[PDB]
Every structure is written in structure tokens, then in C-alpha cells.
Amino acid sequence: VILPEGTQRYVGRDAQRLNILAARIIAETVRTTLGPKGMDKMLVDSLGDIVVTNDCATILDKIDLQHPAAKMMVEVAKTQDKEAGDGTTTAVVIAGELLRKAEELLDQNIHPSIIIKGYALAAEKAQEILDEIAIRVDPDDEETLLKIAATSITGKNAESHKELLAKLAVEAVKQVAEKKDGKYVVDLDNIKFEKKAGEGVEESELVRGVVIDKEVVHPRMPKRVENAKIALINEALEVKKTETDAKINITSPDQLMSFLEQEEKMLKDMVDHIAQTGANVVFVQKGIDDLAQHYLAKYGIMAVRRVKKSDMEKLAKATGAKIVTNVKDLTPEDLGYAEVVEERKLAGENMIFVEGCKNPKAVTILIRGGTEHVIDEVERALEDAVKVVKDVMEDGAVLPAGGAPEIELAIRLDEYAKQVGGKEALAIENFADALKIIPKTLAENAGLDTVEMLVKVISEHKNRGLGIGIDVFEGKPADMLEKGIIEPLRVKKQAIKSASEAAIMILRIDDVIAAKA
Amino acid sequence: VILPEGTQRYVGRDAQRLNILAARIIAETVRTTLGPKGMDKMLVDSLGDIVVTNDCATILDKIDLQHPAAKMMVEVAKTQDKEAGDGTTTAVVIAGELLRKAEELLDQNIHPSIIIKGYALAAEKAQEILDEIAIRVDPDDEETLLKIAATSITGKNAESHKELLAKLAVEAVKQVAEKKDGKYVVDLDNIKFEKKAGEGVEESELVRGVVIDKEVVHPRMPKRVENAKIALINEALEVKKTETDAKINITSPDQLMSFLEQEEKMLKDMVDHIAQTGANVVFVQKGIDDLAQHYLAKYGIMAVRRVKKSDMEKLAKATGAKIVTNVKDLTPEDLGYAEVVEERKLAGENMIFVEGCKNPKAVTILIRGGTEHVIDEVERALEDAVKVVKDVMEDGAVLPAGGAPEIELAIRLDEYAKQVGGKEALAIENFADALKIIPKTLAENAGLDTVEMLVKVISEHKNRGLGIGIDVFEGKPADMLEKGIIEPLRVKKQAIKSASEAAIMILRIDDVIAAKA
Amino acid sequence: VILPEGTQRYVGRDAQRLNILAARIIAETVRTTLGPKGMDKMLVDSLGDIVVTNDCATILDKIDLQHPAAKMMVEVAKTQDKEAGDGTTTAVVIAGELLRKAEELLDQNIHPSIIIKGYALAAEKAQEILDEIAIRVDPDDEETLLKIAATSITGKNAESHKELLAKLAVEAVKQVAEKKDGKYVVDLDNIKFEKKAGEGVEESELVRGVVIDKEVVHPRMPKRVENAKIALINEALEVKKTETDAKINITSPDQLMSFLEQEEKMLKDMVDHIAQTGANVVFVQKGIDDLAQHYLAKYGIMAVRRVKKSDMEKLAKATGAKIVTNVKDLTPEDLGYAEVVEERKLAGENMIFVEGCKNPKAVTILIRGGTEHVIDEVERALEDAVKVVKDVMEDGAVLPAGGAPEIELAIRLDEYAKQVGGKEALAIENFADALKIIPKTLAENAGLDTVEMLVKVISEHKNRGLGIGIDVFEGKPADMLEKGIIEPLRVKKQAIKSASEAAIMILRIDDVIAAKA
């Protein structure tokens, strides 16, 4: 035939109209969760699985989106989460608004070309205004580093212990953080999270070491070692075989024995190699024969087998040990140190705690809570908390929260509009207005009076200054800086990038061709 | 088309309304089993299996719940059972009730935000008041521990012998109970239950050792050993083979014989290493060749094979014996002591009793009973019995029963309401009123006049003091302390935690998105 | 019967009329993307996968065309992309327009023969006019080469950084460029693109070397070499085996050790051959045994395994190293140089950067961007920018853009129409009119007044000259030469070639016989 049936297509009005609608729908689905007073969502997976969260990234991800334009909104939160960690709801909400105000300009008959260009100018000029209004802080000033982390957690379910969790996140990042060129550089892969049900979120702690979900491989091995000299062996403590096909031909009785003894020997020799270094704790990545388990036990050496490769590396960065491929070449300089390596039964499960490490380059945060749900959400809260701390340490700049920056951008980006003038100025002014859904939906989710409230905020801000935003807890405008309610300068800069590009990318699609599914 | 067809979604009122309804429905399904006079449910699964219990946890679990919000109730009972072991029905009922009174506040148009904050202040203040009014008892007062256990057994079917069971339970937990740092620590995993049909629940006893469902592996071995020196071998008593592939090449007739003999020897040598330690009782985790069996029999040693790893660990803890991987290194110091080790044919089934151990660190409770159901339910009773005894030894605090803690919580929490004031006060007052479903549904299941009866109890309590609660056996208020009817301070502190958490979790969800169920 | 059932057929009018319709349809589909102001399309394939692009080649290829004649319009962009690399839209648009004005002549009863012939003449004469009017430039003029590239990128998405991309594109081709026979010859296979999400498009860069998506094979190997002496081994660094079937037969215990040691040596000997050359970095196409890795690690050599054949060759060309099949013959002369070979983590991804090379005959462009889409589209832009800069260096002849060349071919080709006269004159006249969709649909996509604009231009061009065309950013005619807005003389020559070729191909089909479509 001509073009496959059960294949739809839209152009101009249609195309853009549908795309903007789908985009806006998704955006409004999450805006109900923006801020400290935002709500939660219960996502019921087809397999019966239940996820209750405040996280935009998680929601957009779990929800099965069909419309293409809506899936693109997932990329917004996806990029925001991977660049600033926090503000995923914000980026998607602003992208939807930008598209709503944009369609308005389309209805007015303004060429997409003009809207796009005016949006780009507004987007580019916002980065500029933010880089400018940003409050340059001291990279490790623990004071504000504690605020950033806290402000972040106060936006989710777990704000109940914003105090503790903030502290654990600033402490965790400060430890693994690296600086050898002048500024910091944080590899968050160096902060493992351990979630165990039971207890309260109160019992959550920072383990300047590592936690592994394995047991001590032999009954007779120490279930605890004091000042451990740790060995990370990535070789199988078992009877090696030749790459070349080989088989034994027993020809006389005495051989059954001689051979077995020959292997015990090989086995024991490997173990001996490990002991001679003075190592009392060994984490093996591959397997461990039974005899080798026995010899290791007799030397009073604690051994764990089948360790995840990801675990081995965490152990390496935490204890200072060096992973080794050949036991024969293992030396004491390869061994790492842990103030205590013990096997504890946490919530019925046995785990190995490698704590009290020297100056760990990798750390673990043990999360405790009543239910699976409480745990999962706290991990989420923390990941954002950690990610914002990472931003402030690398950037060294912060901003007030509660829509204070978008209000600055609105008020200001409208002047830029005048200067630009023309059709573009229309897009620029609309862009500046779209930016108000943050202060707006913040006061809305809080039960406040959207209309009236949004008037006081722009009032104060115009008077008092850059620090004026809305405090959902106060129910009125306030100086966010004096209240220590702040956020990373990177989180805002990135929301604007993510949203404006998602907006412009849609304002550019004049034809949609979807086949049959 | 944002979502796939066949996907349902609800928002605002709908969401909450349905969640609360599904929660309340499940709650009312179990409330009929609350207290001593509670009723039992019969659960028939698709496979035809029939379960008859009073236990909330089993019911919420066996029943196939589908609505999401209703499953989040299963979690409440799960957390409760994993923390205080008892009060599962109580936590679930107070959750459904907390939500019902919560919706009433929603109907009045009170922002969910307000209800959540007020419910949190109520839950927080409730803990505080419980910590206070808590009757601090002596961590090992045989007296109150015998009570806590009995008050518990009386709530279920098994109260006919609340006498025996409560004794077996306090006795059993005291034996395995471990302390050496000041306070007790109980690992209930060191208490195994053994259920056997026949006889009367009366024949249930505490074996200060371990019962194993295996038989003496050889005909000619001893079926009974006085003062046994016990060996725990976790190695196979069979012809070892090399890791490296190998095969025998018989070249001459005289080889057939000599090779077999060479294996008999290997076998006998292993048996010899065991006999030379003095051990007359061997429990092997793996298998035992037929010859190793024969040699073991000649030395008059009693052996059992294929012993469960969980069993080995118990015999190890119960007899002081150490588990060995190599028979070559078994010393007499690895052996353990059991006053008597005998194979008894308990109800047509052969089993092995290791009794009269020195000081057990693990102990078994043998359960007898007419039917399979009698047995199962008694075990369930015992489990909550052992779990509450564990609570007091670790906590050292108790409270009166019959909803007396809640009546006190109600009266007191309400005052708190006044001082807090505002809309929160409406939430607090309601939270407090919700707690009354315990006394309420206790009198109800009993068959008493709820309305009237609940007026009396709140009266007595206001006068006579914190110990006044309802006594379903008295049909009137009573001083629960003088009656000896009490429960762990943990059970109540945990009910409030669980229920209030769940109530708030659900009160936060303003959107539900589901696929296939 | 005669012909298979469900087999359609068309003749004369039908056949030709349908084919021309199908062809025109596809053409009108892509024309909305032509030029700087062209719009993008959203393509959702059967598996939900989303492709958002401006590229014609991609759109015709992703869309599932069913009609035969429309599938042939794909070959047009296919051929165009393969010979000039740019103007794929231009070629398809002109080919449909050609087929339109051609049907007019068919309706007029002019025999297909006359149209084909007059079209072939209009095409032959078209090249002639181009080769002539062509603005001959210096094969390596840095100036114009930057223009040709920036002009190409402007017509797409990433024109927001036309600046940078232009630069990288010129450098990249100059480097890999080969010219010993007088003029240049560029093998674009020597330019590899590397896409990694994250950062801005600002961070995109040129890597005078290669970038490989592999990591260092052993934990103990250097993660960075300063003045690498790279070795390229296409041999498996593992225990070799005889082609003839073989198997070791162990006949005594000492053998288990002697045989493993024999293989260790073999392995160690290969690594010795690699080290004895002074090579501190080795890339191996096949695998590397575990021991071979250990020796390699001890010697302080950085090794990578399983490297792509395509990568090996890019390294050979980037470093000057020679690939080797037998380590035994590796010499220091087979090694290459790299100012730095380091393993970096880009987007949580581990990659090896062989940068700083001497005179790389192969080079890599690293593409950075917010979303997956941003990147894929920037790569597309670069492939065109690089393919056009390739044409200019090999051809050394540019042209003005903005339809300037087509307007010139139109005016001119009409004269030719006169002198040829007769029926063919009508075909040559219509062919020259067809070439106007370019200036037409450029002004249209821009949102200008087609009719009116197309007149100011045919005018200005007539009075000012060859360099007059439409400037979509200017919204009016302009001298494309003064604006630097130009394109390869090859792009235009191949467009005409491709279009007319196709148009005539369809005009010659008077019967279509299909089985199922």
C-alpha cells in the first residue's frame, strides 16, 4: 500500500496542540507534589507492586507514559536528576508552563520561529541573571552546607528528621569528597546506601566504612576482628586447573590418596600466602574450597566469599586495601585497615560491618525505619540531600528558596523583554510569567490563597529584595536567607536549561508520525 | 492518551475517599477478633487448604487483598509483629479508626496538611505519655513475666492452657536470653518450636536441648546414649574425590579388590578420627557412606546424616559442641554434652531428642495437640507469648490491659488538644477519640453494651486511676493491675507508631495510578 | 488463472499519476524542514522508540514507506548523502517538484518521451551552468572552509553553537586529510564521533587521538600513562592450543603443578615479548588470560582487552603503531606514541582517552549534550559539516546559498529553453521553474510572503547577480557571498543529478505490477 495503516499523524495546529497538551498533562500530574506541603502518589505496578513517593523522577519513571511528548518530559527530570540532583518537579512544572504560555502565542498567530527565538533569549538571559544574583558561599562552610541539605529534605515525606539526615549527608559527602586541583570534585558512587527495615529513621547512621550483606564463610572463623588487616583477593581460592584439557588416570590404589593430598597442598599453599602477610580478614570475590576455608579458619583469619565486584571496590576505597589477582604476589602493603570488622545480625539478616576505617574514600549510610516504604523514601530524600551538597561544594554558590529566584527572574526578565521589543518581547514576557508557577503552585499546595499570596510576594521582593520568597510553613512571604531556607545555584540554573530546551524542542516539532504499536 | 487503556486513576477526594474506605474495610475485617472474647476466621485458599486462626497477621496475610491501601494495612501488622510481637489486631484497628475520624475532618474541608500535622503531634505526644505512665518493672521478675505471657495467650483460642504455655514461654526465653553488658538481649531464633499431633496440648514441654526429625542412620547403632559426648560434623563421611577430573584404569584382576579396600580405608580413617575424640554421638550435616556407617556402628557410636544446617546450629548452641569441617582436626574439646540423646517414636514418627543439655543457648518447645489446627494455633499463641516476654526483659516496662492505656491516652491527649489549639486541635482531639475503638470493640466482641460500658470505663479511669480498663471476663471496668492483666510497654508504643504512620501515609496520597488488578 | 490474486497493476495514466503523487507526497513531507527555519519531526517507531530530527535522510529512513515510488525518493537522499553529504532535503524537494511540473506537461498531452528528453537536456545543461558559475576557492582556504561548515549546521537544531561545531568540523577533516597527488582526498572513516550525555554542547571537543569505551583490564595497572609507547596486539594473550585434538593425561601428583607452571611460563613469555619493546600501554583485540594480566600489571603496563577491530585501526592511525598478529615478532618499531593515555569516567562511564597523539591520521570528536536527543542531533549536524568540508577540499569550488544557485539555474535554463524550442522547450521551461521550490520553501518555512519574496529575489538576482539569494534570518534577498552563507558546488551538482535522475526514472515507468502492498 502507501503508508502503514493504524499509523497516525498530525501537523501544525494539531501536532503542536496535542504535544503541548500531553506535556502539560504530565506536568500537572506532578505539580501537586511540589514543595514541603506537596502531596504523595501511590503508583500501583501491573505486577501488584506498590510505590508511594513524592519524587518526580520516580513517578514519571514508574508511570507508564504513552504519548511521546509526555515521555520527553521524563527526560527533563532525568537530566535534572543527573546534573543538580534536586528540582526535578520544578523543571517539569516550568516546562509545562512554558508550553502553555507558548501555545498562547501560537494562537495569537505568532510564528513558532519567533516564540522559539524569544524563549532562547529569555533562557540565556536567565542563566546570566542567576550567575549574577547567586550568593557566593565558601565551598566547605559547613554552616550553609547543612542548610542546603536540610532545605532539600524538607520537601519530602522524611522531613520528620531533617536534622539528622542533613547531618549524615553533609558528613558523608565531606568525607568522600576529593580536591587536588583547587576545587572539590565529588563522585557520589562513593557513598553506598544500606536500607534495613526495623527500628526508626532515628537509628540511621554514617558508617565510615562499608556494610556487606554476606556472612563469615566458615563456622570456626572469628565473627569479629579488632584491628583488622584486610585482604581483598579477586582469585578463586580453589583447586586451579589447566586451560588445556586435562584428566587424571589413576593406575594404582596409593594414588587416590597422593592426589587428594596434592590438591590440599596447593590449596593450603594459597592460604599460607595470605597468612604470611599478616592478614586476619579476607574478602574473596570468587569462590573458596572447603579445605581452604578450613586452613584459613585454623589461622584465625575471617573470610567472606563471593563478594560483589562493586563491594570489593567500596572495600578498597574504604580500607585502603589493594585488590589482588594473584595470592602469590600478595604483600602486607596490599592489606587494608579497619578499626573493627564484625558480623552482626541486623533485623534477622547477617551482614558484615567494616567500620572505623582510616580515612575512607568510600563510605556507607545505614538507613533504618518501620516499613520498606519509609526506608525507600528516606534513601530518596538522602540522595537528593547528598546531590545538593555536592553542588554547593563544587560550585560554591547558593540561592534563596520558596520561588525567590524565579520571582527575581520574572520581575527582571520582563525588563529584558522591553529591551528586546517586538514579537520576541512577547515570548520573553510570557517566559518570565511562566516562571511564576513555582511561587504559585508552592502557595497552592500549601492551601494558601494563590492569587492574593502571589501579589504580596512580588510586592515584598520588589521592596525587600532577592531573598524574598514564600515560606509554606509561614503562610506568608519571608526573607529566605534569614530563615536559612536555601538551594543550590546549580539546581535553578539547570531547571531553566532543562525546561526551556524541552519547551523549545516541542515548539519545533511540526509533524508527528506514530506507527502501529 | 497519556496512560495505557485499562489503567485507573483517582484524585483528591476520590483518592483519599477510596483509600480510607479500603483501609477501614480491612480494619473492620479483623476487629472482630480483638481481645479474649474475639472470634476466629476460616480462610480457604484456592488449593483447598484451610486455615483457622485469631491472629491478625496470619489473616491479613492469607487473605488475598487487592486494593493497594488495604495491603498497606498488612504492613502495619507486619511491622508490629516484628517489633513487639503482639498487638497486631490493635495497631490495624487503630489505623482504620484514625483514618475514619480523619476523613470526617476532610469533609469539613480541613486541608489534609492540617490533619497530618495534628496527627503527628498526637502520635508524638502519645509516645511521651506512654513512656511516662509506664509501670517500670524488674527485667527478670519471674512474676510479671509470667503474667505478660499469660495475658497474651488469653486473647486467642489457646487460653484453655494459658497456664502451662505461659510457663514454658517465660522459662524458654530466660534460658536463651543473653546479657553481659548490663541489659538483656533475646534472639528468639534460639527457640525452636516442634509440633506433633496426638495427645493433649497438656503434654507440651520445654526440652532443655533440641529435638530433631531424623533417625539413627544404622540398624546396629545405639538408639539411646547416656551422658553423650556429641560431635557436629559438617563434612561428608564418604569417599573424597579430586577437584581435577580423574578416573581409575583397572589393568589387572587384583586391582578390583585393592582399590575397594583403599576406599574402605579412607572411610574408616575418617570414622577413626571421630571415635578417637571420645564422641559416641555424631550429627553429620552431609551424607554418610554405607561403610562409614558400619564402622561407626562397630564403635557403638550413634550417628545421623543429612542434618539441617539450622539444626546443626541449634545442637551447636544447645550442647556446647563446635561444628567441624575437617574430621582430621576434631579434638575432644569440640565435643558437646547432652544428658540424654534418644530416638523416640513420637506419634509413629521417629525423632531424636537431645535433652538435659548443660546450659542451653538454644532450646526447643515440643507442642502436643488433638488436631493440626490445635497445634498451629498454640504455636501462634506461644510465639506472641515468647515475643512479649522478650519485650519486658529488654525494656523493663509494662502497662495495664483492657484498653486502659488508650483510655488514659484519650483523656490525656485531648487536653493536649486544648493547649495546641487551632485546626490541629480538631485533628488531635479526633486522634484521641479514635484510640477508643480498643475499649469499644473489646466490650463489643464480648457482647457488652458498648455505649454504656465505655462511659463507665472512662469514668472509673478518671477516678480510680491509670489502671482502669475493661475486663471482658468481668463484664465491667476493673483495675487491670490488681488483676494482673498487663501487656508490654512496647506493644502500645508500637501500635501507636505503626497505626499513626500508616494513617498519615494514606492521608498524604492525593493520587492513585494503577494498571492490572 | 493468469496473475496471482491480490496482485494490483496500473498502466499509462494511472501508473504515472499515482507514482508522481506518491513521490510528491514524500517530498511535501520533508520540505517543511528545509533551511535554517525548517521545522523538526517526531518519529515514533512500532517499539515506542522516539526519534526527533530535522535530517531528511533519517526521516525517510525511519518512516515506513509502503508505496514503491515513494521508496525511490529515499534512494535520492541516500545517493545525495553519500556523494555530497548535504542537501538531502534539497534533492528530494526538487525531485518531487520536478515530477509535478512534469505531470502538467503530461496532462497537456505531451508524450512522456518529449518530457524525459527535455529534462535530460535541462539537467545536462544544469551541471554546465553550475561548473561555470561555481566560485572556485583555494582547496584549503581556512576562511571559506569555516563558512561552508557553519552554513551547513545552520539549517538544523544545534545551530545554537554553529560557532564551535564549525571549528571542530574543519580541524577534524584537515587533520585526517590526505593529499600527496596534488589535491586532497578525505576518507571520513578516519573521523570517529563519541557521544556522551551530560554537560552542555559547549564541552564538545576534538581529540587528536582516539576515545575507546573500554577500561583498564586489571585493578593494579596504571590508570594513566604520560608518554605512552602503545602496542597494538591482535593475538589472544592466552594459553595456545594445537589444532590437532589434544588432552593432558596426569599420571602422578607432581604433574598437577608442573603443567600449570608450564602454562604460566607460556603466558609470562608473551607478556615478556610485549615488555621487552618498552611498551607501557597495550591494546589487545582478543582476550587476555588472568595470569597474563598479572604479569602485565607487575611490569607497570596498562592493558585493555577485547578491543574493537574498528578501534584497533583508529589507534594504529592515531598513534602510528602497527597492529601485530604474533607477539614474538613485536619490536619497538611497531609501537606508537600518545602524549597521554588515561582512563576517565565520563557519565559514570569508564573510557580510555588516547589523546595528544603526534600526527594522527585518525581523530575523535567528543559530543556532549543535555539529552540523548540533543547529542544525536549534534552528531548529525557534524556529519554534514564534515561531509561538506570534505567536498570543498576535494573540489575547491563553492556556491552562494539561499536558493541563489537555483534562481540562477532557473533564469538561465529558461534561455536554454528558448534556443532548444519546440515541445522540449516546455519541458526545459518547467524544469527550470521547478528549481524554484528551494528559494520558495525557504521563504515559506521562514514564514515569509512566498509570492512577494520570490519576486524581490528573482529581481535582485537578475540585477545584482549569481550571489543573490534569500536570507531567512534577513527575511529579504541578499548577497550570499557578502554574508558568507555558502555551500559546496558538489552539493548543488549532485542534487540536480539525483533529482532529475529520479524524476526521469519515474516518468519512464508506464506500468507497475505489485504482489502485496
Ligand SMILES: Nc1ncnc2c1ncn2[C@@H]1O[C@H](COP(=O)(O)OP(=O)(O)O)[C@@H](O)[C@H]1O
Ligand atoms: N520552607 C519552604 N517554603 C516554601 N517553599 C520551599 C521551602 N523549602 C523548599 N521550598 C521549595 O519547594 C521546591 C522543592 O519541592 P520538592 O517537592 O522537593 O520538588 P523538587 O523536585 O523541585 O525539589 C523548591 O522550589 C523550593 O524552593
Ligand SMILES: Nc1ncnc2c1ncn2[C@@H]1O[C@H](COP(=O)(O)OP(=O)(O)O)[C@@H](O)[C@H]1O
Ligand atoms: N482479660 C482481658 N480483658 C479485657 N481485655 C483484654 C484482656 N486480655 C487482653 N485484652 C485486650 O485484648 C487486646 C489483644 O487481643 P488479641 O485478639 O490478642 O489481639 P492483638 O493482636 O492486638 O494482641 C489488647 O488490647 C488487650 O489489652
Ligand SMILES: Nc1ncnc2c1ncn2[C@@H]1O[C@H](COP(=O)(O)OP(=O)(O)O)[C@@H](O)[C@H]1O
Ligand atoms: N542563512 C540562510 N538563509 C536562507 N537559506 C539558507 C541559509 N543557510 C542555508 N540555507 C539554505 O537551506 C538549505 C539547506 O537546509 P537543510 O535544512 O539543511 O536541508 P538540506 O537537506 O537540503 O541540506 C539550502 O538550500 C541552503 O542554501
Ligand SMILES: [Mg+2]
Ligand atoms: Mg526535592
Ligand SMILES: [Mg+2]
Ligand atoms: Mg495477642
Ligand SMILES: [Mg+2]
Ligand atoms: Mg544541510
